[PDB]
Structures are given as structure tokens and as C-alpha cells.
Design a protein around this ligand. Sequence first.
Ligand SMILES: COc1ccc(C)cc1S(=O)(=O)Nc1ccc(Cl)c(N2CCCS2(=O)=O)c1
Ligand SMILES: COc1ccc(C)cc1S(=O)(=O)Nc1ccc(Cl)c(N2CCCS2(=O)=O)c1
Ligand SMILES: COc1ccc(C)cc1S(=O)(=O)Nc1ccc(Cl)c(N2CCCS2(=O)=O)c1
Lengths: 331, 331, 331
Amino acid sequence: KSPVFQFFDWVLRGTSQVMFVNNPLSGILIILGLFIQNPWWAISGCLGTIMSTLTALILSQDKSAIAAGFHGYNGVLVGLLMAVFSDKGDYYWWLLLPVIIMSMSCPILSSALGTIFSKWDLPVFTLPFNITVTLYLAATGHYNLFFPTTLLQPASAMPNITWSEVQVPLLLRAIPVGIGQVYGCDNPWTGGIFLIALFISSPLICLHAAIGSTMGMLAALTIATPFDSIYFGLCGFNSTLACIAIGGMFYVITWQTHLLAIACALFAAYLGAALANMLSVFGLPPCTWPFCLSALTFLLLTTNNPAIYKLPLSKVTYPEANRIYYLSQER
Amino acid sequence: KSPVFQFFDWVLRGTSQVMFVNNPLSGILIILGLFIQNPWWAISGCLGTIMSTLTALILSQDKSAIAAGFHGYNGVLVGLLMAVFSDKGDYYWWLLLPVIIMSMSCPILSSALGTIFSKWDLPVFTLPFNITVTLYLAATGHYNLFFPTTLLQPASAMPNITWSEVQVPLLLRAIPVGIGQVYGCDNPWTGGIFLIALFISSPLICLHAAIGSTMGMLAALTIATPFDSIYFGLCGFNSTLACIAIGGMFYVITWQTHLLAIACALFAAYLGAALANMLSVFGLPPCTWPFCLSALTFLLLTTNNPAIYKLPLSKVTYPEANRIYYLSQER
Amino acid sequence: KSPVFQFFDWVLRGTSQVMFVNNPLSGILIILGLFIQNPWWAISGCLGTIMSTLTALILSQDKSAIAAGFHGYNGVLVGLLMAVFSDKGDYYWWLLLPVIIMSMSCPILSSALGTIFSKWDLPVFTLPFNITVTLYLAATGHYNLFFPTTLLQPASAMPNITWSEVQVPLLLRAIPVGIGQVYGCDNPWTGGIFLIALFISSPLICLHAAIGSTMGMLAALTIATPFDSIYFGLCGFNSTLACIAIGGMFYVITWQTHLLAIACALFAAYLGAALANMLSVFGLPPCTWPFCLSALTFLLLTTNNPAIYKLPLSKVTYPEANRIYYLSQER
Ligand SMILES: COc1ccc(C)cc1S(=O)(=O)Nc1ccc(Cl)c(N2CCCS2(=O)=O)c1
Ligand SMILES: COc1ccc(C)cc1S(=O)(=O)Nc1ccc(Cl)c(N2CCCS2(=O)=O)c1
Ligand SMILES: COc1ccc(C)cc1S(=O)(=O)Nc1ccc(Cl)c(N2CCCS2(=O)=O)c1
């Protein structure tokens, strides 16, 4: 195939690696979902992925890592979440100038954290996106002349919650919306598209995504989160990412590991509330910080029983193949 | 003995492991002190210890670690410091619902940090409690509908300190109160009870606790801390914990190590002031963060002279036995 | 030579090691620059260096490290930046009391971080100064009775920038001022003196310092930084330090490494804006935090091509000798 087609294949795998799937068709579906939700965000995310993969090539990173989309999955989130939190509205073309530059900083961090994490056979997952986007949103801020960001300020009043006005249909619809909020999209249709794309590659990832999103919603209800945040899906994207990560990918899937994944989703939801309340002091949002922190603290956990088995990163692919390999190695 | 008696022995050792003592009688004395100060806080702390040890058993952690109370010493602090910082007052039974849940997160972190720290033969001491309680207090906050917390806000005015109104008797009484503030208790009687419990196991721990508390008070006076904070003992619990840790436990006790412990107590007091001023921006208090940070930065210190000897964690028990073992190994 | 002369030689090398030069004459020039800018700041910095080296001797640190000034280069910054951010004005002699004490905490941290960093052959450069000065400025704060600090508060209004009023001469003069801002000095003459001192030891360090300062200024212009910050040099000292570090010292100097250094300078400038906006919430300034973070994240970067070569710390001296050694080893 032509090198351009290979590069676009890498970009398509990267845009889907956010949800822990390496599949070009799922990447196409996710791109279609992003364009369904907001074309400007899709353009910004595609530019972020392209520039992140180009910087990975320029910095002479491992070709296998680039071909698997391990470097493009942070540029998409950087571009999408810098277009989401822009106060200048849609099609502010100047926003593409930082979207490029900060995307170039994703492979660098991706490499740096790797050097830190290879000591513990620990994955650095979406952590560079968090650092890069926190850097950008703090550098610019809401009071910037060129690239202002939306205003986030800490809660200063007791919320008015009427539990007789809760809508169970929207509370359930927060599951696909929570799935879609991983990329920053709040449209229910793009959330359903993301669920379909997850199911194409591996059904276990889709099941764990739905379970993580519903656990994030349930954990948000238990601390009296305002219903607007829950309906918007803002309370269940760290949880779905954590449930996907600990569910059957980085651990061999088992009922013990399923319960561990549910516990990690709950912990990620509570850490998401904590970090949303803390980072909002600086005006910054919780952008996948809770997922990274909780997934790291649940992958470093050492447990004696043989059911909770952590796979070497070299052999992690997708949960069903992970289980097949584990049984092949045991026998 | 019956398994229930063994479990309660583990809980009693855990409730005393906060002050670095593994002794069921000292645990009983500390529980009696907590009940003397506030029965509700004692109930919350006991529930925290019970659920932390139960989660350690469920997660199939090392049985020797559980039997020594290495997992129950974080649940007690989580429960106590979540009951202390509750705005709903005494006997708010719903507060036991998070006290359980967050306690379950203490062994997990305890394991995770262990995996991080075993590379440097470094102890993770009370660090999970800090993370868990900071998570809870940030997630809920003072403006929560269900579990509101007490309001902490950064200093915005120059304090009015009259040095002619300082009370030397209360300034001295801040030593036992500073000892008792480790568990969150401000009663002088429970501080004296804690000192007695420390002396039961090993006199060196009691001496280093008193020295650390008085160093925290003295260091707080040097930066013009308001006398109300000093009298309340809020300025000398990180210092006493750091002095206990570096005094004769994790280092072999020597006059060089005694001076190192005093320096660590001073550094922990100053870091406590810094973190109390910084974390109060988010509304969070300094909950043993300074002790952990200063003890880590004083245990990683490399010093050429043979007097400052750091013991492998496998053989740290209590300062007198530590010294006896060190002389046995040298000769 | 007499031991006093040896100790003052160590102090002179330490006061210049901030800019990554080990040369007593450059140390004398830098001290002369500090006295040119403000004699009180020079006295505070000299006391900081003296007490940091004395604590390094007391704590029985490596004599080769002390002789090379590897321990005095943090006391100078601690003293200088605690005298800079004092609200009591010039010749407040009581300020020397903490300048001593916090200086004693520089070797300790210097050792501790070393134990953390030797696993990755990673340098701890100016990181203890950041921790110590952040500790001091947070503990005291602007509302302290004894040692108040200057008030820094987050931006709460959109800045009024008139691009027709920009002064190219001052914008260029921000290069030597940016060089001098490493020590906290804003005088153009002391910046020129620092550039001369850098050129005495090794011209590559001077060139990379100027390039880093101009990259910091250019990166500050791109996010609409107020011109007062740029003219003052506050936007280009982290950048010049990062450019010096990654330029030819810790990497073998090459055009690939030159571009890497320029990229690191840009990243350090943007991280400096981010941390200036974030830390100002607590009232703290960005004091070489961006340099440390960006230099660490660019020294952990793993790159396949042989041009980007990282030197073992044992053999890093100065960029020209680094290149000479690398070619000697290759052939
Ligand atoms: C979706 O994220 C993941 C999904 C699945 C795997 C196997 C890991 C990750 S990750 O979290 O570690 N991200 C990430 C970023 C950059 C590189 Cl270079 C890599 N890898 C290169 C080869 C081995 S690797 O360690 O897989 C992973
Ligand atoms: C009071 O805290 C301490 C007092 C005395 C010792 C020997 C350590 C600690 S600690 O700070 O490291 N906490 C802690 C938490 C969980 C476990 Cl599993 C353990 N340990 C299991 C066995 C070896 S261990 O490393 O002792 C220690
Ligand atoms: C200007 O800073 C640097 C410039 C040049 C070198 C070789 C490192 C540094 S540094 O950033 O690592 N600081 C620093 C602080 C304390 C000590 Cl003890 C040391 N070192 C002792 C000997 C080997 S070492 O690792 O060089 C370095």
C-alpha cells in the first residue's frame, strides 16, 4: 500500500486507541461520531492525531508503536479537548495553531513517562494528554486575549437538588452519553456510535464501557451531584475508561477481575468528583486525570490469588485474545 | 484462639500502628482515649479499621501484614478524620456509609504505593490515608448536600497576635494535645493516654513523640502562627509522627540519628504550615501529608558516616529492638 | 591552600553552578552582578550558598560533589529568591534567619531526590530549591506577621494589550534580562555580566542561554502575555535554563540536539506560563519549576537515532568537553 494510505491507517487506529481498541473500522466509526456531534471538534481532533503521529515519526519512535496507533491516541484527545474548552466558539481557525504545537508535545511526554513507567511494567495511558491539555488550559486561561477558555470556578453555593424531578430516562441515557464523553462529545447518537465501534472490535470492551459508565453515574448520584452533570455524561467517562482498562485488557478477564474493574470504576468516579472540585480552583477541568490515577493505582495492586493476573504489556491486545493467551500459557 | 478474637487482635494492633507501635494493649489504650475524647469519632474510627482489615483479607493480602495491623492503621485514620471534618455534627449515622467505602480504598492504595516504593526499600506510611481522605473531602466539600465538610478557607487578613497574652501553661499543654492530634483528638487527657500507650510498648517512641510535638510547637511559634492553632495541637502532629519515624524506628537510634529526627520534625512542622496554607485553597486540611513527605525525604537521604544507618524494612520492629539487632549484626 | 580558601572556592563554584558552569571566575563575575543589581540580595544569596555547603559538609556528603559546587548552587537560589519575595524591603536582617534554615534543607532534598533519580540516571537540577522556596513562601505567605511575602494573585481581568505600543528595543533587551532573571535579577547590566561569565567557561552555554531566553520571549508573545512581564524577563529564565540543560550539556551537542533544546525551551516557556497561572492561586511564583519539569521530560525521552545521545551523568562536564569525549569514545 502507498505510504499515505499507511499513515491514514495509523491515524485511524490512533483515533480509536483512546477507547483501547486497535481497529481501523472502529476508528472510522469514531471519526463519523465526532463529525456527527460537531464538525469543528472533529477537524481539531484529526489535526491533533495527524500532528502527534508526525511528531512520533520525526522523533524516530518505534515503528510498531506508531503503526498500532499508540501515538495518535493522545493527539486526538488534545485537539478535541482544546476545541471543546475554547471560548471563541466554532471554526476559530487560529485555534489550530496551538492544536498542532501541543500535539507535538504528546509523543515526547509519551516517551518520557514510558521511561518512568517501564520499571514497573506500567502503562502510561492518556497521561500525556492530561499533562499537555492542563498545560495549555492553564497557560491560556479564561482571561486570555488570543485563545480564551471557558470559565470553570469552584462551587460556592449549596446546590438545589429536587429528587422528585429526577428523570430516569435521561439518567439511563447518561450511559451512552457517558461513553461519548470520553472524546468530549455529549450527543447520545455519538455515544451509541462509540458503543457500536467498541462492539465491532471486542464485545467485552463494550460491556465494560457500559458498566463503567453506569457505575460512574451511580457513584455520582451517591454524593448528590447535580443532575445536569449526570445527564451531560460528565460524571462517567473516567469511570468507563477505568472499567475498560482494568476489566479484561490489562488484567486477564475473570469474575474476580470483573469485580476489581467495577471497584476501579467506582474509585475513578469518586476521584473524578474530587479532581473536578479541586482543579476547578485553577479553572481547569478533570480531563482523564481520574482514569489515569485510578487505573495506575489498580494496576500496581499486588494480590496473592492467581485469578487476578496482570499481563505483561508486551502481550496485551484485547480482552478476548488476552484470555485466550492466558489459557494457552497456563496449559 | 477463635478467629473472631484473632480479628479483633488485628484491629487492636492496627489502631495503634498509627503511632508506630504493634501492641494490643496500646491499641486498647488508644481506643479508650478516642472514646474519652468523642464516642462518635471512636465508632467511626473502629468501623474504618474493621473495614480496612476486612478489605485486606478480601484482597488476599499478606497474612503477616494483616496480623501485624499494617492494614488497619489507615482505616482508623480515615474514619476518624472523616468524622472530624463532618459538618452534620455527632452521630450522623449516614456518615458511616462513606467511612466504610473509603476504608476499602486504604488497602488498595497501601498495596499500590508498596509496589512503587519497594524499589527504594521505602515505607508507605499513612500515605494512603492522606490520598483517601483528600479524595473524600474534595469530592464532598463544604457545599455538599449529603456529607458536607467543615469550611476551611485561605487566610485573607493579617493575624492579630498579642505576644503579651501568650500562655506558657497552655503552650506546654500543647505537647500532649499535639500527640493526641495524630488521631484528630484535641483533648489533653486523650493525649496523655496516647503517651502512656506509647510508653507501654517502647519508651523511645514516647520520648521521640514528645520531642516531635514540642519541636512542632516551637517551629510554629517562629513563623508567628496564631496561638489558637498551637494550643489546639494542630501544629505538632506531623512533627511528632516524623520524629517517631526517623528517631529510632526506621533508623538505628543514635545521637546523630536523634539530631536527624529533630531536624525532620522541624522540617515536617514547616512543611505542615506550608501545606495548611496551600491545601486550604481547595478547602482541604493538611492530614499527615507533611509527615509522609518529610519522612520520605529524610529516609531517602544518603549519608556517608556509619552512625546514620537505615534499617531494611524487613527488620524494623521498634527502636530498642532495632538497636539490639544492629549491635548483634555488627558484632 | 588553606581550608578557608578551599571553602570559598567551593562557594564560588556553587554560585555559578546555577547556570551549569563550574568555574570560580564565572562565580566571581556572577557575584559581582548580584551586587550590581542589589547588594541585599547578594548578601542573602551568599549566606544561602555558605549554609548549604556547610550543611553538605555536616551531613557528610561526597567531597567531590561539594568541591564541584553541586551543593552550593541551591542555597544561592534559595537565599536570592527568599530575599526577592520579601515584603519588608531591603536589609531586613531577620530574613537571614530563615535564609539559613531553609538553606540547610537544600542538601537534604538534593540527596533525597538523588536516591529517587539515580534509578534513571536522571539529574536533580534546582529541584530542591523549588521545593524549599515553595515550602517557605507557602508557610509564610503575604499575610505573615514576621516574614511577609509579596502578593501574587491569579489574573481576574482580561489584559489590556496595545500591539502598537510594543517596543522592539526593550523586547530585544529582554534577552539579557531573561538571562539575569535566573538568579532573580532584572537589571540589564547584571544580565550582560551573566552572559560574559557564561562565555568565559564555555561559549556554547552562552549561545544556548541567549537562544533559550529569546525563545521564552517569543513563546510568551504567542499567548498574548502582557508586555510588562516580557520586558521584565519573567518569561524567559526557565526557557534559558532548559535550553542550556538540553543544548549540549546533558546531551551531546548536535543539530538534532540543538533543535531538541529549542523545543525544550519552548515547552519550558509554555509550562512556565501554565505554572505561573496555576501557582499564583496559592500566591506562589513559578520558581524554576518549569525548567525542572521540562528538562526532566526531555531527558527521559527515548529516541532511536544515534545523533540524540544522552551522556551518563558521571561524564557530563561542559558541552565542548562533552562533544570531545563523545567523539573520543566513538572512535
Ligand atoms: C490504550 O492504551 C494502551 C492499549 C494497549 C497497550 C498494550 C498499551 C497502552 S498504553 O496505555 O501503555 N499507551 C502507550 C503509549 C505509547 C507506546 Cl510506544 C505504547 N507501547 C509501545 C509497545 C508496547 S506498549 O507499552 O504497548 C503504549
Ligand atoms: C507504621 O508504619 C510502619 C511501621 C513498621 C514497618 C516495618 C513498616 C511501616 S509502613 O510505613 O511501611 N506501612 C505498611 C503498610 C502495609 C504493609 Cl503490607 C507493610 N509491610 C508488610 C511487611 C513488610 S512492611 O513493609 O513492614 C507496611
Ligand atoms: C547544574 O546541575 C548539574 C550540572 C552538571 C552535572 C554533572 C549534574 C547536575 S545536577 O542537576 O544533577 N545537580 C546535582 C546536585 C547534587 C550532586 Cl551530588 C550532583 N552530582 C554528584 C556527582 C555526580 S552528579 O550527579 O553530577 C548533581
